[PDB]
């Protein structure tokens, strides 16, 4: 485990789910990993289990928590090589009339502005290390998703912002890339399914959304992140799809509330 | 009907299906339309019905038919403003081991090289008119399709070649664009469905592949083509999707022969 | 001029630039056009010149202005067929350390949340009319842009949100599409150039960014919008590029502050 | 070096350039590498230098050479885990009127049909091993390139065919992915530059096409390939861009033969 030995890595939302899979991936590569999370429980458990990981309580929507996160990372470890902006939320399914501008703003604070604020504060140090930024976006930023207008918007912004940052930071040799996971089996996925009338039917539909026939694992996103940080030196501004092929081929897109005619009038 | 008055337009495969929808769209816009088709029946019927359309028998895989097509178009009408490369075939569903290199080559001759050969012979005249090329590709060139390796490859080539041509021909102000239809209800679609064990179930699945809940119509591709030729003067090298949103959102991609686990092991 | 006769169309930011080009395009197609703009001068001039256009002062970042815009549109004209979310701003060039979270939020309010709020309030009426939404995004949402992190992010969100809306609204047959202009010669473009040390050198570089060798015109975006509203009935969730081919081919991407080695060490 | 230990890997065109970089990457990961190349010199040198690599003379455009390649690979090593279709050619710059249908066909034989034929013959064994296919396409398949219509077309086909194969082979858990390199410093790149009036000016323009300010290295493509084969188990049908960001941001796209107006008429 030496492909990223000695590098200092900040992972937001690293207490569980994809974040924890990324923390473990970088630890196994030899990095010093600073777990940023608003929830103490998961981070402390990872901090105690993994020696290379330390936990720093930090809500990325609070400018002062993030400034303290960066300040403590430099003071305690002297450098910063990689920022993985993973902290993010997916609300329950909401139709457009079931969304509010206030909830949209709240979601932007977390999914977009938290990623922006940490990136900006980290860039002075990433420039000195010739480090790199990895944003965790989502496939639905590229292809849309039903009943998720605010969420889809925040992820479209993250993917685009990744490319803008890659252009701004290329003169320092600082790479900025993003991973777009499709359906990854995580506590978030499980919690959203548990809100549905038939949780396991929902999970099964999520599995059938991939030609590979399953959801991904946090560990597979984690391997994608370590590859971007440690072995993708000619990649900047890319969108690495970790989706099981969900974007490929024809599927079933007409919804249960969507008027569809019988097959004797195929084109209306 | 004057948005493309007086322009000379060649439409390959214009005897039926999307081609005929494009012929009718351009005729209604005021163009002189040369129907190129290997089948006399459909072209002659369109030629007789539509005064602005004439029919010239031409198999686009035969270099001499195409050279005669261009030569006759200039001799009879003095100019050439728009080439719509629409002639193309989709074979029945074939697994990769059910394809041959020889059939692939045959399909390349039609779907790709016929489009290439007419474009090359037309370019001297398109340059004088500051005309434009419109290639009919397919959505599956961008997202893939099951059981269609040779077909998907030819359409990936057409879409890419469209962009290469747009770069080569931009110094003459000749635009080169493509339309990528998804599922369009045509005689080709009907013939392929009729080979399946349950034709109407197949048609219905094709309808459900779109969030809009239906297949498109040749007339809707035809309107897209007239827009590209007549009102899209700042568009070159674009891929205009006419797909009903089939590429959007999560669907059902794990095939009936694809081992999928029960939802108690969601990520393998 | 009848391809959109009798339809009621709201165009935000319609007082000048691309917005005015869209207003004129829809008026010429026969629509009733409600010009929404925060600046009275341009809207009143268009309102007085064009009979089919009326002006309603409205700042799209103010929820009450938008609610009054929709309320007045229905009260005065009885229906709503098309919403063109065009109001938007591009700040001067700013490096990431020259951006603030507060300016980002302000830009999100205009470029994203104003588009969201009007869309949500309009959807009850668009559903009754089977109308459609057209968002004006930008090419840089797809490919990034230097010195424009907040702007690029807002446009990435708009493009993605377009696709989410297309999925949510497809059961009503309401289409939701976006246009991504590249470099369009507008007062905004002129004002940004005028901030540069060499305005005309900047304009010239903007012209050279396109294989076609020029910037686009508001009228060309306007024609793209009328096509989406009136003749693209099988298009939903698409990104219509109006860019002159700026995304095509290799160009010059290493910036004047970017360390580039001599050509005797080509790969570092 | 154990991330791909014991796997049998066929690399076409592995004698030099990107192919050799991929051979070395897989050897260092522990694989048994079968170098396929039409040129004995480079392959024999790699075979002798690297113990895990053996060389089998094979022209991928000859169906019998490929059938013998697969037959010998199984007979000598009992299995097949990964096929890297890298063999390919880029002709010198050719305008469309400087291309022939015959040269296009020749280029399709190598760039597309050689990749197709080996893939088809390999699939029975890849299915037993749950292996994977990696195609080396190109960025210009996605964004076009000037003076390269036949080349661009072949790479558009490869990228699309990759996605079709990913759908067909997902029920066996066989992944099919592609890498799209941008400008990689290779003997091919050097040979093409040496045909230009100013080779080093050409190389320099190739370096300036990337925001990172350099071309990539075969080793960086090689690391991307090992990642796809060994650690990307939830990726299928993806296009992994190894391009230095060449696709990002605005550049200089109006060619030296392209009429461009002075900046006092910016939009024509
Ligand atoms: N799970 C999927 O299928 C999926 C798909 C696409 C994208 N994603 C994205 O991946 C990321 C992780 O998703 P997940 O499924 O692992 O989620 P999760 O809920 O399982 O884990 C998210 C973690 O982030 C932390 N977090 C949340 N808000 C925070 C804040 N304000 N400050 C700091 N930490 C905060 C949580 O406490 C938690 O530990 C998110 O950005 C999500 O949008 C997930
Ligand atoms: N129908 C769809 O859903 C769909 C989807 C995506 C792309 N497309 C593409 O659109 C085009 C038209 O498809 P369609 O469904 O209308 O097909 P179709 O079979 O209904 O019509 C094709 C026409 O082309 C003619 N043609 C065939 N081979 C020819 C040749 N060698 N020379 C000259 N003319 C020839 C046929 O005689 C026929 O008139 C094709 O390129 C097809 O691949 C269709
Ligand atoms: N000009 C380009 O090259 C270009 C490129 C890509 C995208 N775009 C987008 O196209 C749209 C129009 O751009 P433009 O160049 O015509 O700009 P512009 O500045 O010339 O015109 C914008 C109009 O919107 C109005 N507006 C601004 N803020 C508003 C608010 N809060 N409420 C209501 N109206 C408001 C302005 O008063 C003005 O009339 C924007 O969304 C912009 O981001 C433009
Ligand atoms: N170099 C770049 O910048 C670049 C960019 C994009 C894509 N690519 C692609 O990457 C691949 C390798 O490119 P490269 O620059 O390393 O090329 P190269 O010329 O340096 O090496 C290609 C190798 O393939 C072998 N080969 C050629 N024809 C063959 C045949 N018929 N059968 C077997 N082997 C054959 C050659 O002998 C040589 O060893 C090609 O597919 C190319 O199109 C390269
Ligand atoms: C299926 C699987 C999913 C999902 C959503 C779906 C449903 N898509 C349908 C197509 C548009 C309307 C609904 O979100 C995560 O996994
Ligand atoms: C559904 C609808 C279609 C179609 C194909 C399908 C089936 N897609 C499944 C996902 C990959 C395996 C099979 O071709 C035209 O319309
Ligand atoms: C050229 C033309 C433009 C532009 C920006 C550029 C500059 N691009 C370079 C590549 C990345 C660093 C800078 O914005 C509008 O028109
Ligand atoms: C610049 C760098 C390159 C290249 C090509 C170019 C030139 N592009 C210009 C934009 C279209 C017309 C010409 O091929 C490899 O590296
Ligand atoms: Cl969805
Ligand atoms: Cl399919
Ligand atoms: Cl830029
Ligand atoms: Cl180019």
Note whether B168 contacts D96, CB cutoff 8 Å: yes
Catalytically annotated residue among C4, C125, C151, C250? C151
Would you call C160 and A141 a contact, using CB atoms and an 8 Å cutoff?
yes
Residues with CB under 6 A from ligand 2: B 12-13, 15-19, 36-39, 42, 59-61, 86-90, 110, 136, 138, 181, 183-184, 186-189
Pinpoint the alpha helices (H) of chain C.
Answer: 17-28, 40-49, 63-77, 101-108, 114-129, 139-143, 149-169, 187-193, 199-208, 218-230
How many residues belong to chain C?
268
Is residue C86 a known part of a binding site?
yes
- Compute the distance between CA of residue B118 and CA of residue B86 in angstroms, rounded to an integer: 11
Can you give the resolution of this entry in Å? 2.2
As a whole number of angstroms, the distance between CA A188 and CA A181 comes to 13
Main-chain phi, psi angles of A239, to 5 degrees: -115, 105
Taking Cα atoms as reference points, which of A103, A133, A149 lies closest to residue A238? A133
CB count in 10 Å sphere of residue A87: 24
Dist. CA A73–CA A11, nearest whole Å:
11
CA distance to A184, C214, D15, D189, per residue, from D186 (Å): 38, 35, 12, 5
Instruction: State the Cα–Cα distance between residues B38 and B61, nearest whole angstrom.
Output: 10
Q: How far apart are alpha carbons D114 and D60 in whole angstroms?
A: 5
Q: What are phi and psi of B104, to 5 degrees?
A: -55, -50
Rounded distance between C-alpha atoms, residue A66 and residue A118, angstroms: 6
Is B172 a known active-site residue? no
Q: How many domains does chain D have?
A: 1
Distance from CA of B65 to the nearest CA of A (A): 34
Q: Report the residue from D143, D189, D263 with minimal CB separation from C200.
A: D263
- Does the CB atom of residue B6 touch ligand 5 within 6 A? no
Strands B175-181 and B132-136: parallel
CA distance B217 to chain D (A): 25
Ligand 3 neighbour C203 (Cβ under 6 A): no
**Quick check: helix, strand or coil at residue D158?**
helix
Q: Who contacts A257 (Cβ-Cβ below 8 Å, separation ≥6)?
A: C171
Neighbours of A252 (CB within 10 A): 17
Instruction: For residue D168, report the distance from its CA to the centre of ligand 10, in Å.
Output: 9
Distance in Å, CA C151 to ligand 7 centroid: 14
CB atoms within 5 A of ion ligand 9 belong to A 145-146; B 249-250
CB-based contacts of A42, cutoff 8 Å, min separation 6: A15, A16, A20
Give the orientation angle of helix D17-28 with respect to helix D40-49, to 10 degrees: 20
Cα C22 to ligand 2 centre (Å): 35
Per-residue b or e along D184-211, where b marks 16 or more CB atoms closer than 10 Å to that residue's CB? bbbebbeebbeeeeeeeebbbbbbbbbb
The CA B241 to ligand 6 mean position distance, Å, reads 17
Q: Answer whether B126's CB lies under 8 Å from B134's CB.
A: no
Write the residue in B113, B156, B167 that is nearest to D159 by C-beta. Answer: B156
Ligand 4 and D22: CB distance under 6 A: no
For residue C164 and ligand 5, the question of a CB distance below 6 A is answered with no
Helices A114-129 and C101-108, packing angle to 10 deg:
140
CA atoms B137, D176, D65, D127: torsion sign: negative
In angstroms, the separation between the Cα of residue D26 and the nearest Cα of chain A is 14
Cβ(C146) to ligand 7 under 6 A? yes
Q: Which residues of C touch A98 (CB under 8 A)?
A: none
Distance CA D242, CA D244 (A): 6
The domain spanning residue B110 has which CATH number?
A: 3.40.50.720
* Complete edge-to-edge strand list for the sheet that includes strand D132-136: D53-57, D32-37, D8-12, D82-85, D132-136, D175-181, D239-242
Helix (H, G, I), strand (E, B) or coil at A54: strand
- C34/C70 Cα distance (integer angstroms): 10
Cα of C126 vs centre of ligand 3, distance in Å, is 23
Q: Shortest CB distance from C212 goes to which of B212, B234, B249?
A: B234
Using CA atoms in the order D202, D205, D206, D208, what is the torsion angle rounded to 10 degrees?
Answer: 160
DSSP string for B49-71: H-TTEEEEE--TTSHHHHHHHHH
* CA distances from residue C82 to B223, C22, C129, C134 in whole angstroms, order as listed: 19, 12, 9, 7
Angle at D66 between CA D65 and CA D71, to 5 degrees: 100
Q: Is B37 annotated as a binding residue?
A: yes
Of B40, B30, B36, B37, which Cα lies nearest the Cα of B8? B30
Binding residues of D for NAD(+): 16, 18, 37-38, 59-60, 86, 151, 155, 184, 186, 188
Interface partners of A (3+ CB pairs, < 8 Å)?
A: B, C, D
Minimum distance, in Å, between the CA of residue C209 and any CA atom of chain D: 5
Compute the half-sphere exposure of residue D156: CA atoms within 13 Å on the CB side of its CA. 31
Whole-number Å distance between alpha carbons of B101 and C83? 50
CA B143 to chain centre: 16
CA nearest to D25 within chain A: A231
CA distance to partner chain C, nearest, from residue D193 (Å): 11
Question: Which residue range forms the structural domain that includes residue B231?
Answer: 1-268
Ligand 7, pocket-test mutation among C138, C151, C195, C209, most atoms within 8 A of CB: C209
A53 beta partners: A33
Contacts of B59 (CB under 8 A, 6+ apart): B38, B65
Residue to substitute in B16, B19, B216 for testing ligand 2 pocket (most ligand atoms within 8 angstroms of CB): B19
Residue D11 and residue D81 in contact, taking contact as beta carbons nearer than 8 Å: no
10 Å CB burial of residue C61 (0-12, 13-18, 19+) is middle
What is the CA angle D235-D237-D239, rounded to 5? Answer: 90
The CA distances from residue D91 to A13, B20, D14, D154, in Å, are 49, 37, 19, 12
C215-229: b (≥16 Cβ within 10 Å) or e: bbbbbbbbbbbbbbb
- Is residue A131 left, alpha or beta, with left meaning phi > 0 and alpha meaning psi from -120 to 50? beta
- Cβ neighbors of D62 (< 8 A, separation 6 or more) are none
Ligand 1: nearest atom to the Cα of A16: 39
- Cβ contact C23:C35 at 8 Å: yes
3-class secondary-structure state, position A169? helix
Residue B251 CA: nearest ligand 6 atom is 10
What's the CA gap between D104 and D228, in Å, rounded? Answer: 30
Distance from the alpha carbon of residue D102 to the mean position of ligand 2, in angstroms: 24
The whole-angstrom separation of Cα A19 and Cα A219 is: 9
Collapse the DSSP code of B87 into the 3-class scheme (helix H, G, I; strand E, B; otherwise coil) and give the result. Answer: coil
Q: Which of D4, D151, D172, D250 does the annotation list as catalytic?
A: D151
Distance in angstroms (rounded) separating the CA atoms of residues A120 and A63: 11
Q: Cβ of A75: how many Cβ atoms within 10 Å?
A: 8
Q: How was this structure determined?
A: X-ray
Count of C-beta atoms within a 10 Å radius of residue D226: 25
Q: What distance in Å separates the CA atoms of residue C13 and residue C85, rounded to the nearest whole number?
A: 8
Whether ligand 3 lies within 6 angstroms of the CB of C210 is answered as no
Residue pair B88/B61 in contact (Cβ under 8 Å)? The answer is no
Spell out which residues of chain C touch residue B243, defining contact as CB-CB under 8 Å: 234-235, 238
Q: How far is A67 from A71, CA to CA, in rounded Å?
A: 6
Q: Which chains touch B (3 or more CB pairs under 8 A)?
A: A, C, D
CB contacts, 8 Å: A212 with chain D:
170, 173, 175, 234, 236
Looking at the CA of C159, name the nearest ligand: 3
Single out the residue of A103, A90, A107 nearest to residue A206, CA to CA: A90
């Amino acid at each position: 485990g030496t492909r990223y030995a000695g590098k200092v890595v900040v992972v937001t939302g690293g207490g569980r789910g994809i974040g924890a899979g990324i923390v473990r991936a970088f630890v196994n590569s030899g990095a010093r990993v600073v777990i940023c999370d608003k929830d103490e429980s998961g981070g402390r458990a990872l901090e105690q289990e993994l020696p290379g990981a330390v936990f720093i309580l930090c809500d990325v929507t609070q400018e002062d928590d993030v400034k303290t996160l960066v300040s403590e990372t430099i003071r305690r470890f002297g450098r910063l090589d990689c920022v993985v902006n993973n902290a993010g939320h997916h609300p329950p399914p909401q139709r457009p009339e079931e969304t509010s501008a206030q909830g949209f703003r709240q979601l932007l604070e977390l999914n977009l502005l938290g990623t922006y604020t940490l990136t900006k504060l980290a860039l002075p140090y990433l420039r000195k290390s010739q480090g790199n930024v990895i944003n965790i976006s989502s496939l639905v930023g590229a292809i849309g998703q039903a009943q998720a207008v605010p969420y889809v918007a925040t992820k479209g912004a993250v993917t685009a912002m990744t490319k803008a940052l890659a252009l701004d930071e290329s003169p320092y040799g600082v790479r900025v890339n993003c991973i777009s996971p499709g359906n990854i089996w995580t506590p978030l996925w499980e919690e959203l399914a548990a809100l549905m009338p038939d949780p396991r039917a929902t999970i099964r539909e999520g599995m059938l959304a991939q030609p590979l026939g399953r959801m991904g694992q946090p560990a597979e996103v984690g391997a994608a992140a370590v590859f971007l940080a440690s072995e993708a030196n000619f990649c900047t501004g890319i969108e690495l799809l970790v989706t099981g092929g969900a974007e490929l081929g024809y599927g079933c897109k007409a919804s249960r509330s969507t008027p569809v005619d019988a097959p004797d009038i195929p084109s209306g």
